[PDB]
Amino acid sequence: MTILFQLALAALVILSFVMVIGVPVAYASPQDWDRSKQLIFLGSGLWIALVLVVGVLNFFVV
């Protein structure tokens, strides 16, 4: 668990950095908006899941 946790958290951090750049750029980008809206929904659902994963896994490494 002490790696499946540390990856889940490193995954949450990396995705967060990608969303931090990607979401504003997408929202203010003229074209390519249909492929953006899909990815933003995907990014979002994945970020939420990873938070729940890191949160649950917290209790197996603390």
Binding site: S16, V23, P24, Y27, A28, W47, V51, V62
Partner: protein, 451 residues
């Protein structure tokens, strides 16, 4: 550039946010994103504090302002304010930091992607600053929200573990509050107390039953008032008294926040109940009293009769009378005789400090507390060199009470300025002369001469 330059908006870049006054959608974005910055700081600052925290040093030797707030709510601490469990601090940090991403998301969405104005999309979320009933309704919603917040504090105190009580009999500890003060004579009494010495208005609140009781009252007052504003429109006397514009409502709120800031400054400087000295360090008054207690103890141990010891001026060196007769400590600390704290009260009787009790009953724990507080008085340099201004480098300390008082005086002051700026501006713009005097209708040219 829908309003995004000076030519079309009438506002330069440095007044850029004024371009948002009638863009309810983007302005909702601004607000929500901003709420996210606040929540972000709460979350990240807490985690930073926790990462830096050494649980066996006092919080106040470590430059913590947030952990102290969490501990005062009963989380993470036991008798004497000792840290028994850091995990509740970590939870508070993490949950704010995660929530900030959500607020940040909503803010960015509304600011740059969603509809610029909301009135076309929704009559419920759209608003005109001049619609008196819509403005009182939104106000009302926020009142109900604030009411619930106050009742959460009550819920923590009464049903979910209690609050850190510095006054707890036998020594400071977390305690469940079962008998909150509901009598309006006590609760509203605090509001009619003088703000001067020995009184201190609401800053004088000295027991958690009054604190919890006061929030039951505010919770219900705010929920009621909120319902009221949802169901009503301003009366005519209110209509004639106020200016009805976004910039005016901002000004009112700036004035209110300035006031609250000054109050908060005073709260943290003097109050040791809701800002427990175990977590925030001693108050200025406290530490000065604690010095007098320290040398009284020392000198009495060497054989001094502290009651009859006349100081150089003719006033008692250790003990003297207040201007109403009460026995108080001497030296410069005479000014601080309204101070009250759990290490000192056992020595106090109906006439003030009790000489029999001083001579016979001072416990080692009182000597320790007094020495600790004397040596962590809230004095220090901007680079965090603890002590008086002539002190040498050695001790890295500035009290959390000083950081919190100073910051909030600075913010309250500039918020007063903002209140005047925006209130004066709102008045002028409502009347039509905020951009200058009409050269062909200069009002002074139609007035008689003064002489």
């Amino acid at each position: 550039a829908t309003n995004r330059d000076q030519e079309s908006s009438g506002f330069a870049w440095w007044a850029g946010n004024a371009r948002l006054i009638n863009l309810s959608g983007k302005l909702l974005g601004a607000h929500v994103a901003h709420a996210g910055l606040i929540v972000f700081w709460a979350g990240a600052m807490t985690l930073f504090e926790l990462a830096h925290f050494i649980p066996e040093k006092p919080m106040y030797e470590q430059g913590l302002i947030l952990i102290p707030h969490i501990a005062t709510l009963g989380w993470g601490v036991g008798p004497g304010g000792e840290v028994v469990d850091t995990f509740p601090f970590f939870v508070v940090g993490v949950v704010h930091l995660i929530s900030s991403a959500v607020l940040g998301f909503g803010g960015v969405y509304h600011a740059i992607r969603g509809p610029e104005t909301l009135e076309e999309y929704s009559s419920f979320f759209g608003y005109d600053w001049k619609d008196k009933n819509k403005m009182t309704t939104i106000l009302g919603f926020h009142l109900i929200v604030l009411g619930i917040g106050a009742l959460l504090l009550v819920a923590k105190a009464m049903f979910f573990g209690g609050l850190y009580d510095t006054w707890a009999p036998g020594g400071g500890d977390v305690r469940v509050i079962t008998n909150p003060t509901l009598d309006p004579r006590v609760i509203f009494g605090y509001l009619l107390k003088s703000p001067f010495g020995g009184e201190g208005w609401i800053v004088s609140v000295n027991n958690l039953e009054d604190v919890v009781g006061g929030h039951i009252w505010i919770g219900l007052i705010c929920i009621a008032g909120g319902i009221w504003h949802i169901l009503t429109t301003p009366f005519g006397w209110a209509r004639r008294a106020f200016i009805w514009s976004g910039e005016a409502y901002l000004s009112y709120s700036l004035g209110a926040l300035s006031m609250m800031g000054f109050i908060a400054t005073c709260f943290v400087w003097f109050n040791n109940t809701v800002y427990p000295s175990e977590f925030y360090g001693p108050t200025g008054p406290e530490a000065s009293q604690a010095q007098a207690m320290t040398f009284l103890i020392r000198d009495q141990k060497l054989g001094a009769n502290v009651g009859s010891a006349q100081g150089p001026t003719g006033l008692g060196k250790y003990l003297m009378r207040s201007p109403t007769g009460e026995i108080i400590f001497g030296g410069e600390t005479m000014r601080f005789w309204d101070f009250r704290g759990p290490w000192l009260e056992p020595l106090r009787g109906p006439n003030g400090l009790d000489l029999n009790k001083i001579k016979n009953d001072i416990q080692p724990w009182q000597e320790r507390r007094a020495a600790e507080y004397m040596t962590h008085a809230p004095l220090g340099s901007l680079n965090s060199v603890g002590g008086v201004a002539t002190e040498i480098n050695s001790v890295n300390f500035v009290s959390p009470r000083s950081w919190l008082a100073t910051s909030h005086f600075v913010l309250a002051f500039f918020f007063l300025v903002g209140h005047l700026w925006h209130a004066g501006r709102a008045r002028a713009a409502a009347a039509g002369f905020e951009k200058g005097i009409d050269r062909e209708s200069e009002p002074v040219l139609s007035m008689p001469s003064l002489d």
